[PDB]
Amino acid sequence: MDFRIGQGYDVHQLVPGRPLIIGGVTIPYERGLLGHSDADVLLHAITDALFGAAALGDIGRHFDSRALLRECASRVAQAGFAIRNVDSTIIAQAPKLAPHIDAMRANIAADLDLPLDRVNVKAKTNEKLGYLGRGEGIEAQAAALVVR
Amino acid sequence: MDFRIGQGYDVHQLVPGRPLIIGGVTIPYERGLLDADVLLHAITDALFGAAALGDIGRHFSDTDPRFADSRALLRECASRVAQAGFAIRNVDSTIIAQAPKLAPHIDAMRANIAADLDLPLDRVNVKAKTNEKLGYLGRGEGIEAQAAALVVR
Amino acid sequence: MDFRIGQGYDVHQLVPGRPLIIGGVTIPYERGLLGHSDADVLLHAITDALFGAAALGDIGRHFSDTDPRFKGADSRALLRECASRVAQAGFAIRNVDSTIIAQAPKLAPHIDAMRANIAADLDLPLDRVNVKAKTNEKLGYLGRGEGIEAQAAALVVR
Ligand SMILES: Nc1ccnc(=O)[nH]1
Ligand SMILES: Nc1ccnc(=O)[nH]1
Ligand SMILES: Nc1ccnc(=O)[nH]1
Ligand SMILES: [Cl-]
Ligand SMILES: [Mg+2]
Ligand SMILES: [Zn+2]
Ligand SMILES: [Zn+2]
Ligand SMILES: [Zn+2]
């Protein structure tokens, strides 16, 4: 059986008067993510991880972020792949993410047509180090397993 | 069969006044990590990720009276992964530290992790990188670990 | 069905007077990457991921930072030897995915060429090799164009 892995990376700046949307979840915060779309850093990293696993290139080559994640899933199936699992990490000094995670995971599992038990979202601070630890941006990392 | 991957990340500040412990190994150095075992946390996180059990923060709170050191948490993690129905297939990882030299300590760390995970030794790998004097890591202000894990149900 | 995964990281400083070589492609640019070898950040990260998947240590173990035979070393040749030691360990490579993070130059026009180089060195079809390119959204030393980073994941099978 023809397994493939992919890995994704994303980061966006924290700016004033933007809403903070991570994993499809709007979170109350003084700042939000700057990007050309809704800047959903978690969903972007997963998207890239999925594109990588199917050897379809990346987010820049192909293109709200949930519609984009859905399209990615469609193009992955187009290529003949099925998604086995997604895992990920959000790196954010603030605000607290713990309470929003199950929701993010539910958003992701819906968009990808996966059962909840095949999707995971983890959260880390940056221990006050670098631009992340200063709350100047937020990073996400993702890993995806697919099979042909 | 029913394979899953997981990935882990971790970082801790590196300052005078503490012992340096990485992958269960104490390392002579003029600094230490605020036990703070980056390598073992990233790997634990990777294992929960693969199992889709959340993360180390949900399982072992900076609160709970039940918790101990990073190898104990790794064992408990492994046991919880087993109960969800997953056997661990392999682990790989990278420590990014500008200093001190990690090469001599690598087989020791791999030995701890394989013991803790109940794996054949040839299923655990640990790599080491500098950050080429770039950023907080390259200035020695902290140390990062990265981990990946394959599991099967 | 004895599958293994690996992951890899690399960074190098971007400096005046050096060739810019990434994924084995020489990119026209006024700066290049600094290292002992040709400092190909992408191939190094992929080499790490392969060594890691096979549990063979890492690129420092196999091709020391200090052995003068690796001065100006072609990193494609290092990747090929890596693939060779992975197969000799009994693994076949199934796929590689990877990411480059760089403020500049534009990497999109060279990405296919990099994928081609990697697929040849690993003896894979193009459709099992993927290369992605990111900016760091202007954050940190990567945003300041001080270095270029790469990440890789590889799946192999015994
Ligand atoms: N920002 C956060 C980092 C880690 N854990 C959280 O719950 N929130
Ligand atoms: N800190 C280290 C960086 C790179 N190699 C080592 O062996 N140790
Ligand atoms: N340096 C680059 C970053 C992102 N995309 C590119 O095409 N190039
Ligand atoms: Cl940038
Ligand atoms: Mg990083
Ligand atoms: Zn993004
Ligand atoms: Zn930690
Ligand atoms: Zn390198």
XYZ file of C-alpha atoms and ligand atoms in Angstrom:
488
model
C 0.000 0.000 0.000
C 1.252 3.352 -1.154
C 1.710 5.668 1.818
C 3.161 9.190 1.582
C 3.948 11.811 4.202
C 3.874 15.614 3.861
C 4.954 18.371 6.228
C 3.800 21.987 6.343
C 4.997 25.232 7.821
C 3.357 28.589 8.159
C 3.818 31.873 10.025
C 1.923 35.200 10.043
C 2.410 38.530 11.810
C 0.194 39.678 14.715
C -1.315 43.075 13.746
C -3.908 45.529 15.239
C -7.552 45.545 14.195
C -7.496 42.144 12.576
C -9.542 39.259 13.864
C -7.582 36.215 15.185
C -8.715 33.146 13.230
C -6.904 29.866 13.853
C -8.271 26.485 12.735
C -11.431 28.284 11.599
C -11.962 29.511 15.175
C -12.314 33.219 15.832
C -10.624 33.993 19.119
C -11.047 37.284 21.066
C -7.724 39.104 21.012
C -6.406 42.695 20.651
C -4.620 41.606 17.470
C -5.033 39.131 14.590
C -3.097 37.551 11.723
C -1.969 39.591 8.755
C -2.162 37.900 5.391
C -3.706 38.342 1.952
C -6.586 35.925 2.952
C -7.981 35.484 6.520
C -4.378 34.419 7.354
C -5.435 31.162 9.115
C -1.872 29.937 9.913
C -2.941 26.499 11.174
C -5.062 25.711 8.103
C -2.290 26.935 5.761
C 0.283 24.580 7.293
C -2.097 21.655 7.024
C -2.911 22.598 3.458
C 0.826 22.601 2.594
C 1.363 19.319 4.447
C -1.479 17.774 2.359
C -0.196 19.220 -0.907
C 3.269 17.886 0.035
C 2.109 14.354 0.736
C 0.332 14.192 -2.662
C 3.376 15.803 -4.354
C 1.088 18.496 -5.694
C 3.429 21.457 -4.888
C 2.237 24.052 -2.388
C -0.215 26.719 -1.357
C 1.535 29.408 -3.574
C 1.308 27.250 -6.704
C -2.468 26.515 -6.296
C -3.871 29.732 -4.861
C -11.387 32.124 3.405
C -8.935 29.357 4.459
C -11.580 26.700 5.109
C -12.755 26.931 1.526
C -9.057 26.654 0.539
C -8.535 23.639 2.827
C -11.624 22.050 1.206
C -10.254 22.676 -2.293
C -6.887 21.185 -1.236
C -8.716 18.035 -0.029
C -10.531 17.917 -3.386
C -7.285 18.204 -5.357
C -5.681 15.544 -3.187
C -8.545 13.107 -4.035
C -8.284 14.221 -7.678
C -4.683 12.992 -7.593
C -5.877 9.621 -6.286
C -4.979 9.964 -2.574
C -7.000 9.407 0.581
C -6.102 11.192 3.800
C -5.176 8.980 6.754
C -4.321 11.490 9.469
C -3.260 15.026 10.254
C -1.301 16.233 13.254
C -0.129 19.772 13.984
C 1.211 22.324 16.452
C 0.336 26.023 16.909
C 3.107 28.154 18.470
C 1.671 31.163 20.223
C 2.769 33.008 23.337
C -0.745 34.459 23.677
C -3.678 34.107 23.902
C -4.613 30.858 25.454
C -5.531 28.256 22.878
C -6.443 25.341 25.058
C -10.142 26.066 25.027
C -10.431 26.349 21.276
C -8.769 23.190 20.209
C -11.570 20.718 20.018
C -13.411 23.230 17.853
C -10.389 23.650 15.484
C -10.144 19.874 15.290
C -13.863 19.642 14.547
C -13.481 22.294 11.836
C -10.533 20.416 10.298
C -12.192 16.983 10.429
C -15.279 18.464 8.763
C -13.396 20.240 5.986
C -11.338 17.072 5.268
C -14.225 14.564 5.594
C -12.373 12.759 8.389
C -13.486 11.314 11.711
C -12.309 13.327 14.690
C -9.885 10.584 15.770
C -7.729 11.125 12.641
C -7.099 14.853 13.333
C -4.988 16.510 15.995
C -4.018 20.028 16.985
C -1.389 20.770 19.669
C -0.347 24.037 21.251
C 2.926 25.419 22.506
C 4.215 28.731 23.718
C 7.666 29.875 22.599
C 8.996 30.290 26.178
C 9.317 34.022 25.484
C 11.983 33.492 22.773
C 12.186 35.329 19.450
C 9.426 37.122 17.537
C 6.995 34.342 18.539
C 7.802 34.709 22.241
C 7.311 38.478 21.941
C 3.864 37.848 20.376
C 4.840 39.379 17.034
C 3.596 36.395 15.055
C 2.161 32.899 15.330
C 3.581 29.819 13.718
C 2.024 26.434 12.797
C 3.558 23.088 11.849
C 1.753 20.179 10.278
C 2.263 16.577 9.303
C -0.142 14.567 7.060
C -0.291 10.876 6.076
C -2.034 9.885 2.841
C -2.289 6.684 0.751
C -2.782 6.359 -3.062
C -2.948 -1.407 7.742
C -3.801 1.667 9.808
C -0.793 3.945 10.045
C -0.691 7.490 11.597
C 2.005 10.192 11.889
C 2.617 12.800 14.549
C 5.085 15.623 14.935
C 6.415 17.469 17.980
C 8.166 20.727 18.770
C 9.688 22.156 21.886
C 12.032 24.909 23.073
C 13.347 26.006 26.529
C 15.509 28.957 27.540
C 19.189 28.292 28.181
C 20.681 30.346 31.059
C 23.282 30.007 33.874
C 22.000 28.413 37.068
C 20.556 25.068 35.985
C 21.602 21.557 34.878
C 21.396 20.707 31.136
C 19.328 17.524 30.644
C 18.573 16.325 27.103
C 16.880 13.042 26.227
C 17.445 11.976 29.840
C 21.177 12.806 29.849
C 22.856 15.425 32.018
C 25.472 17.393 30.150
C 28.417 19.397 31.625
C 27.797 23.014 30.714
C 27.962 26.645 31.938
C 24.111 26.806 31.328
C 20.874 24.754 31.675
C 17.217 24.556 30.524
C 14.399 26.416 32.392
C 13.820 19.144 34.334
C 12.932 20.923 31.018
C 13.944 18.059 28.702
C 13.183 19.559 25.222
C 13.936 16.332 23.424
C 11.660 14.133 25.468
C 8.741 16.634 25.357
C 8.872 17.036 21.583
C 8.843 13.209 21.281
C 5.958 12.810 23.780
C 4.047 15.442 21.787
C 4.730 13.599 18.546
C 3.417 10.393 20.137
C 0.193 12.010 21.373
C -0.196 13.644 17.932
C 0.059 10.328 16.106
C -2.436 8.834 18.538
C -4.617 12.002 18.230
C -4.764 12.274 22.040
C -4.104 16.036 22.173
C -0.745 17.112 23.590
C 1.538 16.936 26.626
C -0.263 19.987 28.124
C -3.628 18.219 28.247
C -2.213 14.964 29.665
C 0.272 16.304 32.265
C -0.818 19.745 33.536
C 1.611 22.249 35.112
C -0.928 21.656 37.959
C -2.063 18.012 38.627
C -0.834 16.438 41.953
C 0.047 13.271 39.968
C 3.193 15.004 38.495
C 7.944 13.593 38.152
C 10.464 13.846 35.309
C 10.340 13.776 31.510
C 11.213 10.082 31.155
C 8.362 9.152 33.509
C 5.951 11.261 31.397
C 7.301 9.639 28.248
C 6.593 6.174 29.709
C 3.069 7.235 30.736
C 2.569 8.749 27.288
C 3.703 5.466 25.693
C 1.329 3.494 27.920
C -1.603 5.769 26.970
C -0.684 5.417 23.282
C -0.755 1.617 23.677
C -4.265 1.756 25.234
C -5.791 3.673 22.339
C -4.683 0.723 20.179
C -1.405 2.003 18.696
C 1.961 0.248 18.470
C 4.940 2.582 17.980
C 6.851 1.906 14.742
C 9.689 4.484 14.998
C 10.786 7.887 16.241
C 13.225 10.375 14.778
C 14.195 13.746 16.119
C 16.553 16.759 15.920
C 18.040 18.883 18.703
C 19.137 22.345 17.622
C 21.784 23.662 20.003
C 24.669 25.980 19.216
C 26.564 24.531 22.173
C 27.682 22.296 23.818
C 28.710 19.460 21.407
C 25.977 16.781 21.504
C 27.567 14.017 19.382
C 29.051 12.111 22.383
C 25.712 11.962 24.153
C 23.578 10.581 21.331
C 23.632 6.808 21.896
C 22.828 7.436 25.610
C 19.718 9.529 24.673
C 18.672 6.874 22.122
C 19.105 4.171 24.751
C 16.891 6.055 27.232
C 14.180 6.681 24.592
C 14.149 3.099 23.354
C 13.950 1.751 26.912
C 11.215 4.253 27.784
C 9.340 3.440 24.600
C 9.946 -0.364 24.677
C 11.352 -0.271 21.150
C 14.188 -1.989 19.358
C 17.129 0.465 19.315
C 17.128 0.552 15.517
C 13.751 2.294 15.639
C 14.924 5.420 17.474
C 17.042 8.162 16.051
C 18.365 11.378 17.377
C 20.064 14.041 15.266
C 21.851 17.257 16.306
C 22.278 20.652 14.560
C 23.679 24.068 15.322
C 21.735 27.096 14.172
C 24.768 28.538 12.386
C 24.910 31.462 14.892
C 21.485 32.726 13.790
C 18.755 33.823 16.172
C 18.215 33.107 19.835
C 19.279 29.466 19.250
C 22.448 30.486 17.446
C 23.283 32.863 20.279
C 22.810 30.069 22.815
C 19.712 31.643 24.469
C 17.801 28.359 24.253
C 17.663 24.973 22.633
C 14.989 23.484 20.337
C 13.841 19.900 19.667
C 11.832 18.440 16.781
C 10.317 14.984 16.607
C 8.363 12.738 14.238
C 6.584 9.463 15.028
C 4.996 6.683 13.009
C 2.419 4.450 14.738
C -0.016 1.732 13.693
C -3.455 0.564 15.038
C 4.907 -3.074 5.544
C 7.839 -2.062 7.800
C 7.503 1.684 7.304
C 9.583 4.398 8.953
C 9.457 8.189 8.923
C 12.180 10.772 9.244
C 12.404 14.544 9.510
C 15.176 17.053 8.801
C 16.172 20.638 9.528
C 18.860 22.868 8.148
C 19.841 26.566 8.222
C 22.740 28.453 6.608
C 23.695 32.095 6.590
C 23.329 34.045 3.410
C 26.618 35.911 2.602
C 28.308 37.947 -0.153
C 30.740 36.120 -2.533
C 29.304 32.531 -2.357
C 27.283 30.641 -4.979
C 23.603 30.135 -4.194
C 22.984 26.418 -4.491
C 19.686 24.972 -3.338
C 18.301 21.574 -4.330
C 21.430 21.272 -6.491
C 20.355 24.301 -8.579
C 22.755 27.242 -8.866
C 20.485 30.294 -8.509
C 21.597 33.683 -9.920
C 21.902 35.870 -6.857
C 24.493 38.249 -5.368
C 24.687 36.244 -2.135
C 24.975 32.511 -1.428
C 24.877 30.104 1.461
C 27.820 29.737 3.811
C 29.148 26.335 4.868
C 31.992 23.806 4.592
C 30.298 22.041 1.575
C 28.400 23.856 -1.204
C 26.065 24.596 1.809
C 22.960 23.259 -0.012
C 20.455 23.741 2.822
C 17.680 21.780 1.158
C 19.644 18.634 0.298
C 21.149 18.622 3.784
C 17.720 18.705 5.389
C 16.550 15.888 3.067
C 19.756 13.904 3.803
C 18.983 14.244 7.525
C 15.464 13.053 7.072
C 16.671 9.980 5.180
C 19.353 9.091 7.722
C 16.750 9.636 10.469
C 14.119 7.377 8.837
C 16.685 4.534 8.554
C 17.921 5.312 12.101
C 21.477 5.885 10.875
C 22.131 9.075 12.811
C 22.548 12.265 10.856
C 24.551 14.142 8.267
C 27.183 15.309 10.791
C 27.854 11.649 11.605
C 28.373 10.540 7.999
C 29.995 13.585 6.449
C 31.720 15.537 9.257
C 31.675 19.362 9.336
C 35.427 19.161 9.873
C 36.714 16.507 7.362
C 38.584 18.631 4.705
C 37.427 16.183 1.980
C 33.959 17.761 2.276
C 35.296 21.300 1.642
C 33.274 22.623 -1.296
C 31.610 19.141 -1.422
C 28.818 18.606 -3.969
C 25.762 18.010 -1.744
C 24.107 15.953 -4.516
C 26.934 13.457 -4.175
C 26.429 13.463 -0.423
C 22.648 12.845 -0.930
C 23.428 9.995 -3.343
C 25.787 8.355 -0.817
C 23.143 8.812 1.892
C 20.555 7.081 -0.339
C 23.143 4.391 -0.921
C 23.692 3.799 2.825
C 19.895 3.808 3.433
C 19.420 1.047 0.812
C 22.376 -0.839 2.236
C 20.548 -0.690 5.582
C 17.661 -2.381 3.656
C 15.222 0.522 3.134
C 13.534 1.709 -0.033
C 12.478 5.359 -0.153
C 8.758 5.993 -0.755
C 8.477 9.763 -0.731
C 10.103 13.051 0.208
C 8.438 16.349 1.038
C 10.239 19.556 1.993
C 10.013 23.307 2.497
C 12.437 26.170 1.875
C 12.011 29.427 3.761
C 13.645 32.469 2.185
C 12.864 36.175 2.039
C 14.656 36.156 -1.361
C 15.371 35.347 -4.150
C 12.150 34.133 -5.844
C 12.429 30.331 -5.692
C 9.333 29.377 -7.749
C 11.197 29.456 -11.131
C 13.765 26.868 -9.848
C 11.533 24.527 -7.870
C 10.863 22.007 -10.676
C 14.596 21.792 -11.346
C 15.252 21.076 -7.636
C 12.600 18.372 -7.563
C 14.223 16.820 -10.674
C 17.690 16.804 -9.048
C 16.351 15.174 -5.881
C 14.290 12.590 -7.775
C 17.348 11.577 -9.832
C 19.725 11.337 -6.779
C 17.201 9.172 -4.881
C 16.177 7.214 -8.032
C 12.514 8.182 -7.587
C 9.886 9.271 -10.083
C 9.048 13.030 -9.932
C 5.648 12.232 -8.430
C 7.256 11.018 -5.127
C 9.290 14.190 -4.517
C 7.834 17.485 -3.358
C 9.479 20.889 -2.727
C 7.647 23.880 -1.190
C 8.802 27.475 -0.790
C 7.778 30.001 1.871
C 8.763 33.477 2.934
C 8.874 33.960 6.727
C 6.278 36.780 6.399
C 9.172 39.214 7.181
C 9.779 37.749 10.667
C 13.148 37.175 12.354
C 16.561 36.549 10.837
C 14.807 34.723 7.993
C 12.713 37.830 7.314
C 15.824 39.985 7.422
C 17.407 37.785 4.761
C 20.152 36.694 7.137
C 19.828 32.998 6.290
C 17.755 30.381 4.504
C 16.148 27.411 6.265
C 14.913 24.068 5.014
C 12.654 21.327 6.377
C 12.139 17.812 5.061
C 10.195 14.642 5.802
C 10.832 11.243 4.257
C 8.973 7.986 4.297
C 10.930 4.738 3.732
C 10.114 0.992 4.070
C 12.274 -2.021 5.065
N -1.125 30.126 23.449
C -1.120 28.931 24.035
C 0.076 28.149 24.064
C 0.039 26.954 24.667
N -1.120 26.492 25.239
C -2.290 27.280 25.201
O -3.322 26.822 25.728
N -2.252 28.511 24.593
N 25.290 21.137 19.693
C 25.671 20.360 18.652
C 25.458 20.831 17.321
C 25.860 20.034 16.300
N 26.455 18.805 16.513
C 26.652 18.364 17.828
O 27.176 17.258 17.975
N 26.239 19.149 18.883
N 11.809 33.071 -1.665
C 10.588 32.666 -2.009
C 9.596 32.527 -0.996
C 8.376 32.118 -1.382
N 8.101 31.848 -2.691
C 9.077 31.990 -3.677
O 8.771 31.737 -4.858
N 10.317 32.413 -3.300
Cl 10.334 36.956 4.717
Mg 11.562 27.156 13.710
Zn -0.470 31.447 5.702
Zn 9.428 21.320 27.273
Zn 23.745 22.319 5.790
